[PDB]
Amino acid sequence: FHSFSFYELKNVTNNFDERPISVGGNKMGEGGFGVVYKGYVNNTTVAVKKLATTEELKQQFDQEIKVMAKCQHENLVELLGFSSDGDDLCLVYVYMPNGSLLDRLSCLDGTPPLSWHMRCKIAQGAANGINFLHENHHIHRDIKSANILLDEAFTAKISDFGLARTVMTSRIVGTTAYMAPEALRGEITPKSDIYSFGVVLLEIITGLPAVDEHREPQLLLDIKEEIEDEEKTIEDYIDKKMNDADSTSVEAMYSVASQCLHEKKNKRPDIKKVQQLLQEMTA
Ligand SMILES: CCCNc1ncc(-c2nc3ccccc3s2)c(N[C@@H]2C[C@H](CO)[C@@H](O)[C@H]2O)n1
């Protein structure tokens, strides 16, 4: 990949501005131990991930390059270049005009609700990205709606490979509301990625965030339990900000999410079965 100067990126990101795009800054957010900044290089808008323990922060940079050097797919964010010459380590990506699936499900900044048709295409696209990672023996470890990006055509692009990668670990990492029971205990398995994807499918169907502090229940994965103990159905949870959803395809996506959400890691389907099921739903 392209080797950029730290000052070339510092110039295009206005000395790494930590303010939002809406006010007059460059910051896009923060996640996998790095801050995303909006820039403009080689006549194109870019995403700049400034990384930024002192050695642990460096390992987060070397992992993402090694995984992406191997990883080239239509459902993964494209790494254009990088920077190592400066104090902070940087990663350059293609700018995703439609931001995250999280922000689009919440209609952040007044954007129109995504239709069921777009939501199906996004689910299928995201599953194809995970499949590519799993085929190439990689575990994402942070599958969530904020890590699913959308391009100029609303194509799903999996981002953030800082945490990428059955093993055990003392450093438990990921997002609680999306985490499988075993991943919360320290296990490292691609079966944890399937569980997290089941939470994403529940967000797609319902339009509700995985965690909402002012909601009952606070965690979206607990809504799956309320439906199983037939107090309610998936139909009662369908996002109301849609006009094109039908019961058949919604129930078909919910079944996939339910299978993904088995608490027993070995009962869950593998990514290739997830793709098959999502493809049959459309078709
Ligand atoms: C309003 C237009 C937004 N456009 C946009 N385009 C590319 C990225 C990349 N972010 C990353 C992160 C890791 C690897 C590649 C990329 S490409 C991004 N990230 C922010 C920040 C956060 C991730 O930390 C996400 O949920 C997004 O909101 N936002």
Domain that holds residue 4: 1-95
Partners of 250 in beta bridges? none
d(CA 70, CA 96): 21
Task: Look at residues 152, 129, 130 and name the one whose alpha carbon lies nearest to residue 73.
Answer: 129
In the listed set 48, 71, 95, which residue is the last one of a domain according to the structure? 95
CA of 234 to the centre of ligand 1 (A): 30
Closest CA to 92 of 40, 129, 144, 30: 40
Which helix (DSSP H) or strand (DSSP E) does residue 203 occupy?
helix 190-206
Pocket test for ligand 1, best of 76, 96, 143, 200 (most atoms within 8 A of CB): 96
**106 has binding-site annotation:** no
246 catalytic, yes or no? Answer: no
Q: Judge whether 67 and 140 are in contact, CB under 8 Å.
A: no
Reported structure resolution in angstroms: 2.4
Same domain, 41 and 176: no
Best CA proximity match to 101, nearest among 82, 124, 81: 124
- 160 phi-psi bin (left φ>0, alpha ψ -120 to 50, beta other): left
Give me the CATH number covering residue 199: 1.10.510.10
Number of domains in the chain: 2
Q: Which of 17, 88, 142, 151 is catalytic?
A: 142
- Please, are residues 129 and 161 in contact by the beta-carbon 8 Å criterion? no
Domain stop point among 61, 95, 129? 95
* Domain end (from 36, 68, 95): 95
**Which long-range contacts (C-beta less than 8 Å, at least 24 apart) are formed by 66-70?**
67/138, 67/161, 67/164, 68/1, 68/161, 69/1, 70/136
- E strand or H helix that includes residue 92: strand 90-94
∠ CA 69-89-42, rounded to 5°: 70
Do both 83 and 112 map to the same domain?
no
131 in the same domain as 249: yes
90 and 109 inside one domain: no
Residues 216, 221, 225, 226, CA torsion sign: positive
Whole-number Å distance, alpha carbon 97 to ligand 1 midpoint, is: 9
Amino acid, res. 270 = D
Clarify whether residues 23 and 105 are in a common domain: no
**Same domain assignment for residues 270 and 152:** yes
Is the same domain home to 172 and 145?
Answer: yes
Asked if 25 and 100 sit in the same domain, the reply is no
Q: Are residues 73 and 20 in the same domain?
A: yes
Q: How far apart, in whole angstroms, are the C-alpha atoms of residue 239 and residue 62? A: 40
Q: Which two tokens stand for residue 259?
A: 């299978």
- Select from 237, 178, 171 the least CA-distant residue to 206: 237
**With a 6 A CB cut-off, is 25 part of the ligand 1 pocket?**
no
Answer yes or no: is the C-beta of 93 below 6 A from any ligand 1 atom.
yes
Ligand 1: centre distance to CA 19 (Å): 15
User: Which of 45, 49, 48 is CA-nearest to residue 60?
Assistant: 49
